[PDB]
Amino acid sequence: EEPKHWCSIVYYELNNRVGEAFHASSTSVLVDGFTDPSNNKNRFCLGLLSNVNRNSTIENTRRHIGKGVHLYYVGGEVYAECLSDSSIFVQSRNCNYHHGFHPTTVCKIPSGCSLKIFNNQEFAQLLAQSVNHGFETVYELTKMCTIRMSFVKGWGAEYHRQDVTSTPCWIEIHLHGPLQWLDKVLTQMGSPHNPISEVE
Amino acid sequence: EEPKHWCSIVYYELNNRVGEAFHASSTSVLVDGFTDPSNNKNRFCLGLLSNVNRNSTIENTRRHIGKGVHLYYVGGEVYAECLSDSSIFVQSRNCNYHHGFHPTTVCKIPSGCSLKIFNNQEFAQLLAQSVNHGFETVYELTKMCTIRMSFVKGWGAEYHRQDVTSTPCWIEIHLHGPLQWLDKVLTQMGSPHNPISEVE
Amino acid sequence: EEPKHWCSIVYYELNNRVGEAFHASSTSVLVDGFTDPSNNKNRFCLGLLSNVNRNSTIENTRRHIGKGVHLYYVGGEVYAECLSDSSIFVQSRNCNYHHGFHPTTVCKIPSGCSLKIFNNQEFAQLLAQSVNHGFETVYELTKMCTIRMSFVKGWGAEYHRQDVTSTPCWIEIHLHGPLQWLDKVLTQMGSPHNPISEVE
Amino acid sequence: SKVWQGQAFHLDRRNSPPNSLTPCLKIRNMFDPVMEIGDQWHLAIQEAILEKCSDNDGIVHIAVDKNSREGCVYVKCLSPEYAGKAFKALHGSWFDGKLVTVKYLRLDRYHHRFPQALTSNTPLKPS
Amino acid sequence: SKVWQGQAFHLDRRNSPPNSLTPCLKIRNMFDPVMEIGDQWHLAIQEAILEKCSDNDGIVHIAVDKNSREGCVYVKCLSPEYAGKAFKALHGSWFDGKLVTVKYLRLDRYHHRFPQALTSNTPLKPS
Amino acid sequence: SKVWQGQAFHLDRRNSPPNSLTPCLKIRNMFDPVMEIGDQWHLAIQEAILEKCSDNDGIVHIAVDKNSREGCVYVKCLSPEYAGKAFKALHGSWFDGKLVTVKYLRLDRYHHRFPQALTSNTPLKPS
C-alpha cells in the first residue's frame, strides 16, 4: 500500500531545526541551496531559510550546497544522486544492512555519484522476520525508516564530527512507506511486559 | 459557529517541541506512540518523531505510551479517554472550573477511564459574564482554551515535576471553537488603558 | 510570474520561534494579538500562541500588539500600515535602498502611519544589474527578500536592543515573488570558484 | 470493569474538603441506569460505596437513584464529621471508568425525599 | 489627522545629513492633491513646514506643488546651512501618516521654475 | 566519466576486511553491459581494476562478465593474502559513479566456471 507522500524531509543546521518540513509530492525531490520558496512539489530549497543561530562556518557550507542532492523513489527503491559540486554524506541503516556494512556507517557520495539508499522489499522481509523476536526487536526497526545526510562536511568514525548534529548542513528523511508497514505490525504486537513508575 | 478544525495538537518532550503540529479533521483524534505518518486524519502518531535532545528517560516513557489517548468532540463537549496501559495526566481549567477544583489541578486518568475535559456552553457562559469585568478578565480566558496533558508521568503539586515541561512526553491541545468565540469578544473590547515604553 | 503565496510570515519571541508559519492567501494579511486560530486566510493571530519560555516582559508587550500591522501587496508594492496603538519597527533593505538610508536602518512606523516597505520593479532592476558583478553579489540579494519587524519595542542603533532578537515580539516576512525571480538567476550563474574542506 | 481506580488527585491543600455542616451527601457519576439490567444491580452500587468507606462507622442510610442518568446515590450520616470522612473517600475517585464527585445537601430537604432515613441509625458495612 | 508623528529614525551617524552646497530643497510625500478640497488647503501645508521649522530663521521662499501627486513643496533658503537645518527637521519625519523625504535641487534650476524667489528674502514664521 | 572517485568509507575497525580463506573474488557494480558498445570495452574494465590494484603483484586471472547486468568481473589470485589486498583496494570504492562491492567465492566453483584460470599464473599490470 502506498502513502500520501513517499517521504518527508527536515533540514537542520548543527543541532537546530531550520525551516518548515518538506513533503514530497512526486517521485523526484531536489534538495538544493537556492531560493525558490514553493516547497510543495519537487524542489526543497534551503537558501531562503533563516536561522538566528547561523554562524560563519554554517554560512560558508551553505554556499557550496549548490545543486545539492537528487532523491528519487522508482521501482520500490530510493536513490541518492549527488548533483552538488561538493560531496554528501548519507547514513542509511537499510543500505548498510544490504552490503554488510556496520549499521552506523556513513557513506561518502562524491559529486556525480549515485547510491541506492533504501530497498522496500528488504525492509518488508526484515519486518516479517522480526515479528518472532519480540516487541523490542520490531520497535527497533523504526530507526531504519529514517535516513540522515549532510552536505559538504563528513561525519562518523573518521571525522572529528562524530554525530550528524556536528555538521553545519544536514537533512533527515522519513520514509513513509516503511513507517506505514511497520505501524500495522507494531499495533498488533501489544506492548512490552515491563513496569514504569509515575513518580521517578 | 464551527471552526475548520475543532482542535490542533502539539507534542513536546521536556521543554522541546517535537514534530509538526497536528490538525484534527474528524471528531475523533488518536494520539498514540506508533509510527503511521499520516497526520491528516484521526491518528497523531508520536513514535516516528525524531528529537536530537532525546535521552534514555524520555525514550523509556515513549515505549509505554502505547494506544495513548482518545480525544473526541461530541455534543459540544470534549472527552479524554485513556487507551494506554499507563495513565495520562490532564490539566484543564474549564474542567477544573466545573467541579470546583483548583484551576491548576492536574487530573490523573487511569488506564481505561474517561474524563470530560471541556464543555462549550460553560465557556460561552463564562465569556459573557467576563465582558463586564474589563479587558484583562476576558483576555485571561485565553488560558482556558488550551489543555496540557502528559503520558505516563505525573506532574503538579504532588510530584517532583512541578511543571508539565518536566515531564518527558506531553501534548498541548488548542480548542479552536472557544478561541474563535473569544476572539470576536476580544476584538470588540478595544485595548487596555495602560502605557508601555519603546526603550525599556 | 506570480507565486502561490506572495509572502510567508514567521513569529518570534526574543530568540525563539513561536507557532507555525503563516502563508498569505490574499493580497491583505493582518498580524494582530488576538486569538482567531484560522491562519489560512487574511488574519495571522498571535494571542493564541504558546511559548514555554515566555516571561513577564514578553507577556506585557503582547498585550499592546492590539490590531497590530496590516501588510498588503497591491500594484507590485508591499506596504506596512500600523493599526496598533503602539508603534512597529520595520527593517527593509529594499525600502532603505530606495530612500538612500543605511541598509541596516530600522524605521519607526508610529500608530496610524503607513510605509512602503518593498517595490518589485526596483528589486528586479537591482537583480539585473547584479548579474555582471559575480555570484556573491547576486547571492547577497537573498538578504533583500526578507523583512524583519517588531511590535512595540524598538531596535537598532539608538536602542539598547541592537538586534531584533532582543525584542520580545517580532515577525519575519519572506517575499516569495523576489525569491522566485532571484532563484532563476542564481541557478544560471553556477557556483563560486572556491574550495571547501570536508574535515575542518 | 466495576472497580475503583484510585483518585484523580489528592484532596489536600488547594483542593481541601470543605467539611460542611451537614451529614448528607449526594454522590455523582456512579453508574448509568439504562446500562444496568435486572433490579438487583443497586446492591453492587451500595456495596461498592461501603467497600470504599470500610473505615467509616457512620453511614446510616444509603439510597440509590435508579432513574437519574447522573448516576446519583444519596447517603446520610450521624454527624458532619462522618459525612466529611465519606467525602474524602469518594470525591475525586475513579469508579467503573468514570470520575465520582460529591456534593453536600441540606438536611431538611434530605428527609423530605427520604423520610425512612430518620430511624436508620445502625452503621452499614461491606461483606 | 494632519499632525506630525516624530521621525522614522534619528538622522545621525550612518544616516547623516549630506549638507549639500545648495540652499534649495524639494520636500516629498506631504499630501495628495486629489484628496484636498478648495484652494485654501496649501496654507496648512506651508504652515506645517514652518511649524516643524520654527527654529529656522532662513526660509525665504516656499512653494507648494498642487499638481504633482508626489506631494512636493519647494523651499529656498539664504545659505546651505539654513537649507541643511530644514533638511534635519523634515527628512525622515512623519506627517499625515506618510513618511516625508527631502532632496537637494540645483540652484540654477530652482530659479528657472520659481523666478519670484530671488527677491523673497524675509524669514517666514508660524502663527 | 569512467574514473575512480575514492571510497565511500575507510575499511577499518567496524568495516574490517574479512580476509577469507579463498583466492577468488567477485567484483560488483562496475558497468552495465547494455550501455557498452563494441567488443573492446572490457579492456578498459580490466585495466581499471589493475590501475586501482597497481600495487598488487598477485592477480593471475581476470574475467569480465559481459552478460550479467550486475556488472561483475571475476578475479583469482595466488593466495588469499593477495585476494584480500585486492578486496581492500576495490570494496567500497567509487567507479563510473557507482559503488563497487566485492564478494568472496569458493575456489572449487571458480575453476568450474573458468577452467582457463589454473595455468594463468603470471601477474597482471597496468599500462
Side-chain angles (χ1 to χ4, degrees):
Chain A
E1 229 286 334
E2 284 299 300
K4 181 186 185 182
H5 314 286
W6 70 266
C7 73
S8 53
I9 316 183
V10 152
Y11 169 66
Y12 289 79
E13 294 186 2
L14 293 176
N15 58 315
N16 295 122
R17 254 215 64 188
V18 177
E20 297 174 291
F22 177 90
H23 295 83
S25 54
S26 58
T27 62
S28 195
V29 10
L30 246 71
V31 187
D32 63 27
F34 301 107
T35 65
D36 190 300
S38 83
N39 68 332
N40 70 334
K41 37 193 166 192
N42 64 325
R43 267 234 286 174
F44 183 15
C45 292
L46 303 176
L48 67 139
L49 301 180
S50 296
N51 172 10
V52 292
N53 306 293
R54 187 171 292 157
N55 64 13
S56 52
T57 298
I58 301 175
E59 184 49 49
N60 192 248
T61 298
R62 306 174 77 246
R63 224 141 274 163
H64 282 69
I65 300 184
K67 298 190 207 181
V69 61
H70 175 208
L71 306 159
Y72 57 99
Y73 171 48
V74 54
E77 301 176 303
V78 183
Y79 292 81
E81 167 175 11
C82 180
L83 301 186
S84 156
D85 281 347
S86 309
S87 308
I88 63 186
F89 293 81
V90 181
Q91 162 182 93
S92 169
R93 280 182 184 251
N94 184 257
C95 166
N96 295 338
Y97 188 82
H98 184 123
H99 303 129
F101 303 157
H102 190 278
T104 62
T105 303
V106 178
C107 289
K108 184 202 193 184
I109 306 179
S111 168
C113 301
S114 311
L115 176 68
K116 173 178 324 174
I117 54 158
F118 199 87
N119 182 291
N120 280 345
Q121 235 225 306
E122 297 186 341
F123 180 76
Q125 189 175 311
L126 186 49
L127 181 59
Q129 302 167 359
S130 282
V131 173
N132 312 84
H133 285 61
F135 173 84
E136 203 67 39
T137 307
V138 164
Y139 190 59
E140 260 287 310
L141 288 185
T142 290
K143 290 202 190 269
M144 191 147 301
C145 299
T146 55
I147 293 162
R148 290 134 98 97
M149 177 200 125
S150 88
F151 298 99
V152 176
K153 308 269 168 185
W155 53 291
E158 179 202 329
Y159 305 91
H160 183 84
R161 315 183 203 255
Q162 291 293 304
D163 319 289
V164 78
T165 48
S166 300
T167 72
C169 299
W170 59 282
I171 55 166
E172 191 173 42
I173 303 151
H174 290 253
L175 298 187
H176 288 200
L179 281 173
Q180 208 176 304
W181 315 330
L182 172 71
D183 169 87
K184 314 225 177 311
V185 168
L186 274 170
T187 55
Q188 294 292 113
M189 304 237 299
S191 74
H193 326 112
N194 293 127
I196 194 165
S197 165
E198 312 176 334
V199 180
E200 63 178 309
Chain B
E1 229 286 334
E2 284 299 300
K4 181 186 185 182
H5 314 286
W6 70 266
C7 73
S8 53
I9 316 183
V10 152
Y11 169 66
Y12 289 79
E13 294 186 2
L14 293 176
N15 58 315
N16 295 122
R17 254 215 64 188
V18 177
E20 297 174 291
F22 177 90
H23 295 83
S25 54
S26 58
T27 62
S28 195
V29 10
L30 246 71
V31 187
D32 63 27
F34 301 107
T35 65
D36 190 300
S38 83
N39 68 332
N40 70 334
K41 37 193 166 192
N42 64 325
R43 267 234 286 174
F44 183 15
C45 292
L46 303 176
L48 67 139
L49 301 180
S50 296
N51 172 10
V52 292
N53 306 293
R54 187 171 292 157
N55 64 13
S56 52
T57 298
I58 301 175
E59 184 49 49
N60 192 248
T61 298
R62 306 174 77 246
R63 224 141 274 163
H64 282 69
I65 300 184
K67 298 190 207 181
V69 61
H70 175 208
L71 306 159
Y72 57 99
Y73 171 48
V74 54
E77 301 176 303
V78 183
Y79 292 81
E81 167 175 11
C82 180
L83 301 186
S84 156
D85 281 347
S86 309
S87 308
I88 63 186
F89 293 81
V90 181
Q91 162 182 93
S92 169
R93 280 182 184 251
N94 184 257
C95 166
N96 295 338
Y97 188 82
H98 184 123
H99 303 129
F101 303 157
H102 190 278
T104 62
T105 303
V106 178
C107 289
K108 184 202 193 184
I109 306 179
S111 168
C113 301
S114 311
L115 176 68
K116 173 178 324 174
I117 54 158
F118 199 87
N119 182 291
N120 280 345
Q121 235 225 306
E122 297 186 341
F123 180 76
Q125 189 175 311
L126 186 49
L127 181 59
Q129 302 167 359
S130 282
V131 173
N132 312 84
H133 285 61
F135 173 84
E136 203 67 39
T137 307
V138 164
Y139 190 59
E140 260 287 310
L141 288 185
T142 290
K143 290 202 190 269
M144 191 147 301
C145 299
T146 55
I147 293 162
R148 290 134 98 97
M149 177 200 125
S150 88
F151 298 99
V152 176
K153 308 269 168 185
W155 53 291
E158 179 202 329
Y159 305 91
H160 183 84
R161 315 183 203 255
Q162 291 293 304
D163 319 289
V164 78
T165 48
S166 300
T167 72
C169 299
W170 59 282
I171 55 166
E172 191 173 42
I173 303 151
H174 290 253
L175 298 187
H176 288 200
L179 281 173
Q180 208 176 304
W181 315 330
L182 172 71
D183 169 87
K184 314 225 177 311
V185 168
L186 274 170
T187 55
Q188 294 292 113
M189 304 237 299
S191 74
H193 326 112
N194 293 127
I196 194 165
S197 165
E198 312 176 334
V199 180
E200 63 178 309
Chain C
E1 229 286 334
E2 284 299 300
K4 181 186 185 182
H5 314 286
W6 70 266
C7 73
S8 53
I9 316 183
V10 152
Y11 169 66
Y12 289 79
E13 294 186 2
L14 293 176
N15 58 315
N16 295 122
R17 254 215 64 188
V18 177
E20 297 174 291
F22 177 90
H23 295 83
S25 54
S26 58
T27 62
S28 195
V29 10
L30 246 71
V31 187
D32 63 27
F34 301 107
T35 65
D36 190 300
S38 83
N39 68 332
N40 70 334
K41 37 193 166 192
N42 64 325
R43 267 234 286 174
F44 183 15
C45 292
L46 303 176
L48 67 139
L49 301 180
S50 296
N51 172 10
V52 292
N53 306 293
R54 187 171 292 157
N55 64 13
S56 52
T57 298
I58 301 175
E59 184 49 49
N60 192 248
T61 298
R62 306 174 77 246
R63 224 141 274 163
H64 282 69
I65 300 184
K67 298 190 207 181
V69 61
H70 175 208
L71 306 159
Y72 57 99
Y73 171 48
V74 54
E77 301 176 303
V78 183
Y79 292 81
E81 167 175 11
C82 180
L83 301 186
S84 156
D85 281 347
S86 309
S87 308
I88 63 186
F89 293 81
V90 181
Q91 162 182 93
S92 169
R93 280 182 184 251
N94 184 257
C95 166
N96 295 338
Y97 188 82
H98 184 123
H99 303 129
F101 303 157
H102 190 278
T104 62
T105 303
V106 178
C107 289
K108 184 202 193 184
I109 306 179
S111 168
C113 301
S114 311
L115 176 68
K116 173 178 324 174
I117 54 158
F118 199 87
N119 182 291
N120 280 345
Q121 235 225 306
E122 297 186 341
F123 180 76
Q125 189 175 311
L126 186 49
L127 181 59
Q129 302 167 359
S130 282
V131 173
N132 312 84
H133 285 61
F135 173 84
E136 203 67 39
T137 307
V138 164
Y139 190 59
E140 260 287 310
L141 288 185
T142 290
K143 290 202 190 269
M144 191 147 301
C145 299
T146 55
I147 293 162
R148 290 134 98 97
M149 177 200 125
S150 88
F151 298 99
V152 176
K153 308 269 168 185
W155 53 291
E158 179 202 329
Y159 305 91
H160 183 84
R161 315 183 203 255
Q162 291 293 304
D163 319 289
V164 78
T165 48
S166 300
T167 72
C169 299
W170 59 282
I171 55 166
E172 191 173 42
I173 303 151
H174 290 253
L175 298 187
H176 288 200
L179 281 173
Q180 208 176 304
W181 315 330
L182 172 71
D183 169 87
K184 314 225 177 311
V185 168
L186 274 170
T187 55
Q188 294 292 113
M189 304 237 299
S191 74
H193 326 112
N194 293 127
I196 194 165
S197 165
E198 312 176 334
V199 180
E200 63 178 309
Chain D
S1 248
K2 224 121 171 178
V3 161
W4 298 91
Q5 312 194 225
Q7 308 171 358
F9 54 87
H10 287 342
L11 278 72
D12 348 57
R13 270 289 204 262
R14 297 139 314 106
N15 295 297
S16 70
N19 304 330
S20 290
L21 297 343
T22 329
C24 299
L25 310 171
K26 161 172 147 163
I27 306 157
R28 221 195 164 282
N29 214 232
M30 279 245 91
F31 53 90
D32 182 6
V34 307
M35 302 192 58
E36 308 283 340
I37 41 88
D39 294 321
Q40 218 73 5
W41 64 264
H42 68 252
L43 270 72
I45 296 293
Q46 300 184 354
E47 195 85 5
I49 290 153
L50 280 47
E51 288 170 358
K52 191 88 176 50
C53 305
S54 37
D55 187 13
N56 188 319
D57 307 283
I59 299 113
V60 295
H61 169 263
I62 181 170
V64 181
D65 190 338
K66 315 177 95 180
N67 288 343
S68 180
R69 310 280 299 271
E70 293 179 26
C72 303
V73 2
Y74 298 70
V75 171
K76 182 182 179 196
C77 309
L78 292 158
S79 74
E81 160 81 16
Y82 293 110
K85 187 170 185 156
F87 187 99
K88 287 172 204 175
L90 302 165
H91 187 66
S93 288
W94 287 99
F95 179 81
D96 199 34
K98 292 246 57 185
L99 179 71
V100 176
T101 40
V102 179
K103 190 86 171 176
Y104 286 89
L105 312 186
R106 282 171 162 251
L107 179 50
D108 53 353
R109 302 201 241 158
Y110 191 95
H111 279 160
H112 177 82
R113 169 154 171 75
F114 314 108
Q116 197 253 39
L118 284 148
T119 68
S120 293
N121 293 318
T122 170
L124 300 168
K125 292 298 171 173
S127 317
Chain E
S1 248
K2 224 121 171 178
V3 161
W4 298 91
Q5 312 194 225
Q7 308 171 358
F9 54 87
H10 287 342
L11 278 72
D12 348 57
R13 270 289 204 262
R14 297 139 314 106
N15 295 297
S16 70
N19 304 330
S20 290
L21 297 343
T22 329
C24 299
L25 310 171
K26 161 172 147 163
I27 306 157
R28 221 195 164 282
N29 214 232
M30 279 245 91
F31 53 90
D32 182 6
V34 307
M35 302 192 58
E36 308 283 340
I37 41 88
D39 294 321
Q40 218 73 5
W41 64 264
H42 68 252
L43 270 72
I45 296 293
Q46 300 184 354
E47 195 85 5
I49 290 153
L50 280 47
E51 288 170 358
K52 191 88 176 50
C53 305
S54 37
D55 187 13
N56 188 319
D57 307 283
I59 299 113
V60 295
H61 169 263
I62 181 170
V64 181
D65 190 338
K66 315 177 95 180
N67 288 343
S68 180
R69 310 280 299 271
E70 293 179 26
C72 303
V73 2
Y74 298 70
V75 171
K76 182 182 179 196
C77 309
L78 292 158
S79 74
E81 160 81 16
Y82 293 110
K85 187 170 185 156
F87 187 99
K88 287 172 204 175
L90 302 165
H91 187 66
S93 288
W94 287 99
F95 179 81
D96 199 34
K98 292 246 57 185
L99 179 71
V100 176
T101 40
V102 179
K103 190 86 171 176
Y104 286 89
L105 312 186
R106 282 171 162 251
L107 179 50
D108 53 353
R109 302 201 241 158
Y110 191 95
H111 279 160
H112 177 82
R113 169 154 171 75
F114 314 108
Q116 197 253 39
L118 284 148
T119 68
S120 293
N121 293 318
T122 170
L124 300 168
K125 292 298 171 173
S127 317
Chain F
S1 248
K2 224 121 171 178
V3 161
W4 298 91
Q5 312 194 225
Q7 308 171 358
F9 54 87
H10 287 342
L11 278 72
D12 348 57
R13 270 289 204 262
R14 297 139 314 106
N15 295 297
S16 70
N19 304 330
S20 290
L21 297 343
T22 329
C24 299
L25 310 171
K26 161 172 147 163
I27 306 157
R28 221 195 164 282
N29 214 232
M30 279 245 91
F31 53 90
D32 182 6
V34 307
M35 302 192 58
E36 308 283 340
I37 41 88
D39 294 321
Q40 218 73 5
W41 64 264
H42 68 252
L43 270 72
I45 296 293
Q46 300 184 354
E47 195 85 5
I49 290 153
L50 280 47
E51 288 170 358
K52 191 88 176 50
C53 305
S54 37
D55 187 13
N56 188 319
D57 307 283
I59 299 113
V60 295
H61 169 263
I62 181 170
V64 181
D65 190 338
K66 315 177 95 180
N67 288 343
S68 180
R69 310 280 299 271
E70 293 179 26
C72 303
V73 2
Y74 298 70
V75 171
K76 182 182 179 196
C77 309
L78 292 158
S79 74
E81 160 81 16
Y82 293 110
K85 187 170 185 156
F87 187 99
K88 287 172 204 175
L90 302 165
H91 187 66
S93 288
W94 287 99
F95 179 81
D96 199 34
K98 292 246 57 185
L99 179 71
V100 176
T101 40
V102 179
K103 190 86 171 176
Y104 286 89
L105 312 186
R106 282 171 162 251
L107 179 50
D108 53 353
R109 302 201 241 158
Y110 191 95
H111 279 160
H112 177 82
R113 169 154 171 75
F114 314 108
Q116 197 253 39
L118 284 148
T119 68
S120 293
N121 293 318
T122 170
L124 300 168
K125 292 298 171 173
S127 317

